[PDB]
């Protein structure tokens, strides 16, 4: 603590006073991982490996929950043409949990395949499938041209070019109504200013990459609107109480201790917030319980020392630190110099029962100085001498002796 004073002040000498070198830290030991255990596997191969797919105007929605997935086919082993992600990192797919999954499978040409993204406008982008600006997910593409294509063209997959107004996102258009740009009624058939909006793709294997179809499955991720769907796949550890450790609970992190909860709980609730707007409580995924979270590493380290022209003895002060449980130094932790004050415990000063005039203040009425083979002592600040005179009505004191005193006051201008 002599060397910690010179680091913050950027001086090679130490002046006379009380300084704050650093703050009290608690290093975490283990990491509690509590993840749910499901014996079911997630059928991702139904939507990925199927022969027949839907079109861009009406797709097949899929909700997958209450299983255990494998994300290594999206990331680790990837024999795919183009894989992209936006909000969630592809490295971090094994970590996070989300609200629900929407698997949207459609077959799209290679010229129009770049319009699946937030903030796009085009033929396929406007009137079929839109994404909002806050949308989170990944785009997986693979070249399908050696399988479902045809030499004379594929008329099975269809798309819709024409619509009157802009379509709301996450909505399928089943309407067969003829687009009417004129004042003449179309009556369901072609005519003047009457076009049939539903057309067929140009797909052939023999031409370039604009005519090659791609298999695009877009996953929808929404964050913190609900508890966990599948889980992030990992291992699982035990549940440690009354010890400061790192937390990872369904992707949400934290540092603190786990204590019992006397407050009532909500059965639909994963976690909640205190008056400090941080997570004070969490629910176990496997069984339904609630435990309180109190954070760690609180308080500060202050030093009390005379200057370098006097001695090297440095007294250290913890403020707001519980001293029953106890910086890189272990050397003063043997004890027996510890005196308990209001602000904390003072290590390195011997408490005396006398009352003197001190120099370096601490607080709460208890001060400290350097007095006499000499050491730092701590005591209570003196009020001065005590004067006791008996008084009556018939006595007076008139001074018979005078002196002239000269005092000096300094005011900066």
């Amino acid at each position: 603590p002599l060397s910690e004073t010179k680091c913050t002040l950027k001086s090679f000498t130490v002046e006379k006073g009380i300084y704050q070198t650093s703050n009290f830290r608690v290093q975490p030991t283990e990491s509690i991982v509590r993840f749910p255990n499901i014996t079911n596997l997630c059928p991702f191969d139904e939507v990925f490996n199927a022969t027949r797919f839907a079109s861009v105007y009406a797709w097949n929605r899929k909700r997958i929950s209450n299983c255990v997935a494998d994300y290594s086919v999206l990331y680790n082993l990837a024999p795919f043409f183009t894989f992209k992600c936006y909000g969630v990192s592809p490295t971090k797919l094994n970590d996070l949990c989300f609200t629900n999954v929407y698997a949207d499978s459609f077959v799209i040409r290679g010229d129009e395949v770049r319009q699946i993204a937030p903030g796009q406008t085009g033929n396929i982008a406007d009137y079929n499938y839109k994404l909002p600006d806050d949308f989170t997910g990944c785009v997986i593409a693979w070249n399908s041209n050696k399988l479902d294509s045809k030499v004379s063209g594929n008329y099975n997959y269809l798309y819709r070019l024409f619509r009157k107004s802009n379509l709301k996102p996450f909505e399928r258009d089943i309407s067969t109504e003829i687009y009417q740009a004129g004042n003449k009624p179309c009556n369901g058939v072609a005519g003047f200013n009457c076009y049939f909006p539903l057309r067929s793709y140009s797909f052939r294997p023999t031409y370039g990459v604009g005519h090659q179809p791609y298999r695009v499955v877009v996953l929808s991720f929404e964050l913190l609107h609900a508890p966990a769907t599948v889980c992030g796949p990992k291992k699982s550890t035990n549940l440690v109480k009354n010890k400061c450790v790192n937390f990872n609970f369904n992707g949400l992190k934290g540092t603190g201790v786990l204590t019992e909860s006397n407050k009532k709980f909500l059965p639909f609730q994963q976690f909640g917030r205190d008056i400090a707007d941080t997570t004070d409580a969490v629910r176990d995924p496997q069984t339904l319980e609630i435990l309180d979270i109190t954070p760690c590493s609180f308080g500060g380290v202050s030093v009390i020392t005379p200057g370098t022209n006097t001695s090297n003895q440095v007294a250290v002060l913890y403020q707001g630190v519980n001293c029953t449980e106890v910086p890189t130094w272990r050397v003063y932790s043997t004890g027996s110099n510890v005196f308990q004050t209001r602000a904390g415990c003072l290590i390195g000063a011997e408490y005396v029962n006398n009352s003197y005039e001190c120099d370096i203040p601490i607080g709460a009425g208890i001060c400290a100085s350097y007095q006499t083979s000499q050491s730092i002592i701590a005591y209570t600040m003196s009020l001065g001498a005590e004067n006791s005179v008996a008084y009556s009505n018939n006595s007076i004191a008139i001074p018979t002796n005078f002196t002239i005193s000269v005092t000096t006051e300094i005011l900066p201008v």
Epitope: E30, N238, K241, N242, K243, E260, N262, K264, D284, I290
Partner: antibody
């Protein structure tokens, strides 16, 4: 199979040091905490101390302060308990247990038992 | 802390009856809707064994004649039907507050 092993008997003089052994097998030693209990005949069970083996931090009873010293060995996966200056009332039957966690923490398994006789 | 005291010290129950042995608590062990209590049964020459956790539940491998109930500071361990292998000392334990304490204990006898 998880089984905790202890020696049967240990002879120690009063005023000397007491060293005991609890061998852990079948589980990770730094993952699960260890507990030491004390059983005198006719009195029942009394609780000595509990130690986190990874941090080497001890939790002791108020009456049992400075009599017992808890230390661990993570290389051999063997927990130790060091008693200082035993008396005639300190001779008892000692167990060690594995503390498993599911909300309220139970004691899943137990050791073979150790009878410590203090005499010269 | 929480001091557990069981009454009486010894109880002799004949075969076929119901044994009522209570573990009384000085403070409330109920928090989060679930109380913190365990039950131990110690045969002589052997370490004690775990029976009932959280009270409302029963450990697998323990037979169905060992049951318990109660809420708050008043718990009740009901032993029925009484068999000759059930004579042993009964204990109760709270893990809630540090430092943990142990109960006084109650030994069950067979009246023949």
């Amino acid at each position: 199979q998880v089984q905790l092993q202890q020696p049967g008997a240990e002879l120690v003089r009063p005023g000397a040091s007491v060293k005991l052994s609890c061998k852990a097998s079948g589980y990770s030693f730094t993952r699960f905490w260890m507990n030491w209990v004390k059983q005198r005949p006719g009195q029942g069970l009394e609780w000595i101390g509990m130690i986190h083996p990874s941090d080497s931090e001890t939790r002791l009873n108020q009456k049992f302060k400075d009599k017992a010293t808890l230390t661990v060995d993570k290389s051999s996966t063997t927990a130790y308990m060091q008693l200082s200056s035993p008396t005639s009332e300190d001779s008892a039957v000692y167990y060690c247990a594995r503390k498993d966690y599911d909300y309220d923490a139970w004691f899943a398994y137990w050791g073979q038992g150790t009878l410590v006789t203090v005499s010269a | 802390d929480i001091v557990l005291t069981q009454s009486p010290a010894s109880l002799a129950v004949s075969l076929g009856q119901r044994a009522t042995i209570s573990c009384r608590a000085s403070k409330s062990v109920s928090a989060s809707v679930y109380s913190y209590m365990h039950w131990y049964q110690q045969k002589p020459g052997q370490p004690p064994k775990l029976l009932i956790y959280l009270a409302s539940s029963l450990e697998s491998g323990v037979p169905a004649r060992f049951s318990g109930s109660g809420s708050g500071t008043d718990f009740t361990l009901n032993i029925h039907p009484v068999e000759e292998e059930d004579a042993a000392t009964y204990y109760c334990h709270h893990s809630r507050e540090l430092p943990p304490a142990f109960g006084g204990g109650t030994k069950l006898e067979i009246k023949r």
